[PDB]
């Protein structure tokens, strides 16, 4: 008897939402400059260092980003390795991490409640989210696209109308699909692996989310392919409690380091060559 994604919901039919120009960009990707001195940086993470490990929110439902490797049994992926570089800067080695398993829908609340130090879970930086949490500079820039079986006629956004499209709850992906007119039948799940299972069992017709995540689903199921135009920019940031500006500055120093010392390029080649040759790392933007 076939696996079933626990938590699969067919959403109530709703009229399309307009594309949001009201609060579109508050310049959301601009973040806080790193500390100039090593001593300042070490002081900003003294509490984490005293706790003995960095507590990182993510889940294991995003192949290539955060997932459990079936051979080693370890949580691994690009987001796991990004978080490990923060831990390296705090402790000297990347090993000192504890994961709190959080769905996409739980990222903001976990940060608000100080249940994790950081979220590294493909977290798009948006103006709406910046009212509630803080973010590092951009560490990867993705774009929303469409994933369908190779024999599917779906190749453009308008083809999704009336068809069953899967998104994880609590994502920008859902908001963007809610703009499509006429609407698709919107099926929501806990995580992106659940969308893959639904498609493999022909319970949906397509998945739409970050092309990075979709490429991870293609790696698991090469019967699928990515189609369609860029539907919405997705600049990933490390999510941080709104008031912990010192940790924002610290993480932004880590990102400056890995953009410039080759680590970012190494991590891209390690995980993301399905997307093509490594681009330059995203250029950071600073408010101050
Ligand atoms: N990156 C988008 C969609 C993918 C995801 O994070 O689950 C978001 O922050 O919601």
Numbering used by the authors: 41 to 328
Give the article text.
The conserved aspartate-specific solute-binding protein (SBP) GlnH links extracellular amino acid concentration to PknG activity via the periplasmic transmembrane protein GlnX, thereby controlling glutamate metabolism in Mycobacterium spp. GlnH belongs to the solute-binding protein family, specifically the polar amino acid binding family, which bind to arginine, cysteine, histidine, glutamine, glutamate, and aspartate. The fold of GlnH is related to bacterial solute-binding proteins from ATP transporters and to the sensor domains of glutamate receptors: two lobes close around the Asp ligand in a Venus flytrap-like arrangement. We propose that the amino acid concentration in the periplasm is sensed by GlnH and that protein-protein interaction allows transmission of this information across the membrane via GlnX to activate PknG.
To determine the structural basis of discrimination between higher- and lower-affinity ligands, GlnH was crystallized in the presence of Glu and Asn. Overall, the structures with different ligands bound were similar. The greatest difference is in loops 99 to 103 and 109 to 113 (DIGSN and DPITG, respectively), which are displaced 2 Å in the Glu- or Asn-bound structures compared to the Asp-bound structure. The conformations of the ligand binding site and positioning of the ligands are similar. Contacts between GlnH and Glu are the same as those between GlnH and Asp, with the liganded Glu adopting a bent conformation such that the side-chain carboxyl group occupies the equivalent position to the side chain of ligand Asp in the GlnH-Asp complex. Glutamate and aspartate were identified as the stimuli that lead to rapid phosphorylation of GarA. Our structures of liganded GlnH represent “closed” conformations. Sequence alignment of GlnH homologues that are also genetically linked to PknG shows that within the order Actinomycetales (which includes important human and animal pathogens like Mycobacterium leprae and Rhodococcus equi), conservation of the residues that contact the R group of the Asp/Glu ligand predicts that these proteins are also likely to be specific for Asp and Glu.
